[PDB]
Design an enzyme around this catalytic site. Structure first.
Site, PDB file in Angstrom:
ATOM      1  N   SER A  20      40.506  60.619  55.953  1.00  0.00           N
ATOM      2  CA  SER A  20      39.128  60.861  56.341  1.00  0.00           C
ATOM      3  C   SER A  20      39.082  61.595  57.674  1.00  0.00           C
ATOM      4  O   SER A  20      40.104  61.815  58.325  1.00  0.00           O
ATOM      5  CB  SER A  20      38.351  59.548  56.430  1.00  0.00           C
ATOM      6  OG  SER A  20      38.858  58.736  57.473  1.00  0.00           O
ATOM      7  N   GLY A  62      29.093  61.509  67.548  1.00  0.00           N
ATOM      8  CA  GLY A  62      27.864  61.749  66.829  1.00  0.00           C
ATOM      9  C   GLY A  62      28.112  62.069  65.373  1.00  0.00           C
ATOM     10  O   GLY A  62      29.149  61.733  64.799  1.00  0.00           O
ATOM     11  N   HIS A  91      34.192  55.175  87.039  1.00  0.00           N
ATOM     12  CA  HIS A  91      34.328  56.104  88.153  1.00  0.00           C
ATOM     13  C   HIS A  91      35.300  55.609  89.216  1.00  0.00           C
ATOM     14  O   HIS A  91      35.650  56.376  90.120  1.00  0.00           O
ATOM     15  CB  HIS A  91      32.966  56.359  88.804  1.00  0.00           C
ATOM     16  CG  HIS A  91      32.891  57.643  89.566  1.00  0.00           C
ATOM     17  ND1 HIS A  91      33.435  57.805  90.819  1.00  0.00           N
ATOM     18  CD2 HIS A  91      32.313  58.825  89.257  1.00  0.00           C
ATOM     19  CE1 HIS A  91      33.209  59.032  91.250  1.00  0.00           C
ATOM     20  NE2 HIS A  91      32.529  59.673  90.317  1.00  0.00           N
ATOM     21  N   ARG A 109      42.199  68.658  55.800  1.00  0.00           N
ATOM     22  CA  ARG A 109      42.095  67.440  54.999  1.00  0.00           C
ATOM     23  C   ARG A 109      41.670  67.724  53.567  1.00  0.00           C
ATOM     24  O   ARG A 109      41.737  66.826  52.723  1.00  0.00           O
ATOM     25  CB  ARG A 109      41.134  66.439  55.649  1.00  0.00           C
ATOM     26  CG  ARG A 109      39.732  66.950  55.925  1.00  0.00           C
ATOM     27  CD  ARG A 109      38.694  66.546  54.882  1.00  0.00           C
ATOM     28  NE  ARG A 109      38.492  65.104  54.810  1.00  0.00           N
ATOM     29  CZ  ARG A 109      38.148  64.459  53.702  1.00  0.00           C
ATOM     30  NH1 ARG A 109      37.955  65.130  52.577  1.00  0.00           N
ATOM     31  NH2 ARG A 109      37.983  63.146  53.719  1.00  0.00           N
ATOM     32  N   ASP A 138      38.156  60.250  88.101  1.00  0.00           N
ATOM     33  CA  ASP A 138      37.292  61.132  88.869  1.00  0.00           C
ATOM     34  C   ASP A 138      36.491  62.027  87.929  1.00  0.00           C
ATOM     35  O   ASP A 138      36.443  61.817  86.715  1.00  0.00           O
ATOM     36  CB  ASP A 138      38.115  61.960  89.853  1.00  0.00           C
ATOM     37  CG  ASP A 138      38.704  61.121  90.964  1.00  0.00           C
ATOM     38  OD1 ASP A 138      38.104  60.080  91.304  1.00  0.00           O
ATOM     39  OD2 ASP A 138      39.764  61.503  91.500  1.00  0.00           O
ATOM     40  N   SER A 159      34.377  54.453  69.068  1.00  0.00           N
ATOM     41  CA  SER A 159      33.243  53.891  68.348  1.00  0.00           C
ATOM     42  C   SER A 159      32.507  55.023  67.654  1.00  0.00           C
ATOM     43  O   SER A 159      32.155  56.014  68.296  1.00  0.00           O
ATOM     44  CB  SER A 159      32.311  53.146  69.298  1.00  0.00           C
ATOM     45  OG  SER A 159      31.189  52.638  68.606  1.00  0.00           O
ATOM     46  N   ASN A 160      32.269  54.876  66.355  1.00  0.00           N
ATOM     47  CA  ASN A 160      31.709  55.946  65.541  1.00  0.00           C
ATOM     48  C   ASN A 160      30.398  55.483  64.926  1.00  0.00           C
ATOM     49  O   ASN A 160      30.335  54.405  64.328  1.00  0.00           O
ATOM     50  CB  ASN A 160      32.698  56.366  64.449  1.00  0.00           C
ATOM     51  CG  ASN A 160      32.328  57.682  63.794  1.00  0.00           C
ATOM     52  OD1 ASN A 160      31.317  58.294  64.119  1.00  0.00           O
ATOM     53  ND2 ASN A 160      33.166  58.132  62.873  1.00  0.00           N
TER      54      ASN A 160
END
Lengths: 229, 229, 214
Positions: free
Chosen positions: A58, A174, A203, A44, A207, A149-150
């Site tokens: 980004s 993270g 679940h 990038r 699996d 989700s960040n």
């Protein structure tokens, strides 16, 4: 006084029942791995050089593309439990979550497995104009088959979100830090950038060995980006 | 024989219904960060020198003070869901959890945002005389708006506790270890002490970006203690 | 002119003095203003208000009032900082100075300069208090000795921060340090000699090592 009482609006009245439905019925279990982001930062760097003036790419754009390609190799992370039918989808619809001061609303990027990087980067920015300024249609933020989700822009190293009720997976990214590894150097060590990822499966449809191979493909694309071709 | 059967006493009969009420209704989600404790250990070294004979200041005392100041900057981590009213509190009442051989009971430190360090350190020790020897009033351990639970004295690096049912947050502290970082040294690396923290929010009153700023303030006070003034 | 004549005739003043090393305060407010960019600014007249409110809790007899039958002992410190307008000498009040942090006080002293100098004060905003700090170090005065407010028992008087030198254990034999001269003025009816001498023993100790304020 000591305490201050606030009534509940109609936005959080609807969200608080989607959350309680999600945790009671769905048996969550978590997974984790860390990804070397050393080779994405060199791609990038020179894609933004060849793409002057028009757009900007980004690090939250490689993650949307690598997630849509990894769901094609392992298609069980793209399903839905409907209590009689495990509906398996063939179209990846990633629902990126963005944070407004009004709440937490998720615009949808349709067909993320055929689009290039520049098409996605002008979809994420153009839906920030829609969502933050309140011009969304009800079919623009409700749906999708996957969710990213960040929270790496606040310093959080790991977290574990809550799955959307029809969906089976969610991702949780993270913050990119700087660690060091033992190498074959004369000194004995090198320095490298890392990033910690936390999947959260359902679940009933996924699996343990199936979801562990999703993170084996997601790690492999972002470590060498040429493999995306 | 093979198995041995034990009846249930009236202490664990009450606790086992508070636990099942907490997990079924509250949609938990977890967060994490690590804190550099390098500058706290140089402050409590010379505060104990200037405070000879009278009292002793531990590392579990800076954590109670930094948590009460961080709830004033971000007041949404100090609320309570009452199914019609999000009761927002203006008084921080930290409930420190301590472990007796009889069970797990939580004495309360009232008004932790105005007290100094020496006043708290003589409240934590003096409530160990009350709680472990069974001289507690029912209004001394039932209540509070926040909860700190520490297991760093057993070697646990991370854990994730269960929130008290009226409360919205809880903290969970690991054990202080010794890591090493890449630095601008001639060698290239330094050594530093670290500590791993794990918040556990209620998603109905605390969003993702709100709880991520609580850990951005909690990290900032304990990294430079002069900022507490 | 009648508050002044009532104060000197009835109250038997006696004075005290000590000098304070301000070498470690100047290294704390250097890097507190760095971490607090843009928002506010922290001055050396702000550490003095915080150290005075904490020292009155250790020695509570410097916080009393003589009422000719009852020595009213207060539990709430209300420091009345004196400021000088061209119209006269008026004293805004900083309420509850023993629980507030430094940034809360620094935005109270500046915001009451907008009130007092431009004449927007309420009568309950500048009349009252249990203690008084008066500063004249911005004019070069080394020592002075003010007049106590009639209900109050103490007042403070701060000189100007100068540069002295001390005998040290250096190879040369001397170091250079900043000093500041303080002058308390007690009421002898409620404050003895040994009591007021311990107030200046606590006030000196906080401002010489600011970490002790925690």
């Amino acid at each position: 006084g000591v305490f201050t009482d606030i009534p509940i609006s109609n936005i959080r009245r609807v969200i608080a029942q989607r959350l309680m439905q999600s945790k009671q019925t769905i048996p969550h279990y978590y997974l984790s791995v860390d990804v070397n982001m050393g080779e994405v930062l060199l791609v990038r760097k020179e894609l933004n050089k060849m793409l002057e003036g028009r757009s900007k790419i980004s690090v939250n754009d490689f993650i949307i593309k690598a997630s849509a390609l990894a769901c094609l190799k392992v298609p069980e992370a793209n399903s839905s439990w409907l209590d009689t039918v495990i509906r398996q989808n063939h179209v990846v619809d990633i629902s990126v979550a963005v944070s407004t001061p009004a709440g937490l609303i998720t615009p949808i990027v349709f067909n993320a497995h055929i689009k290039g990087l520049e098409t996605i980067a002008n979809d994420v920015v153009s839906l920030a104009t829609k969502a933050r300024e309140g011009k969304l249609q009800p079919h623009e933020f409700q749906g999708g088959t996957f969710t990213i989700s960040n929270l790496g822009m606040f310093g959080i190293k790991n977290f574990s979100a809550i799955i959307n009720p029809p969906q089976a997976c969610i991702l949780a990214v993270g913050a990119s830090e700087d660690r060091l590894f033992p190498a074959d150097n004369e000194k004995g060590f090198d320095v490298a950038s890392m990033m910690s990822v936390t999947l959260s499966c359902d679940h009933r449809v996924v699996d343990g060995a199936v979801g562990a191979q999703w993170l084996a493909e997601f790690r492999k694309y972002l470590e060498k980006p040429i493999t995306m071709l």
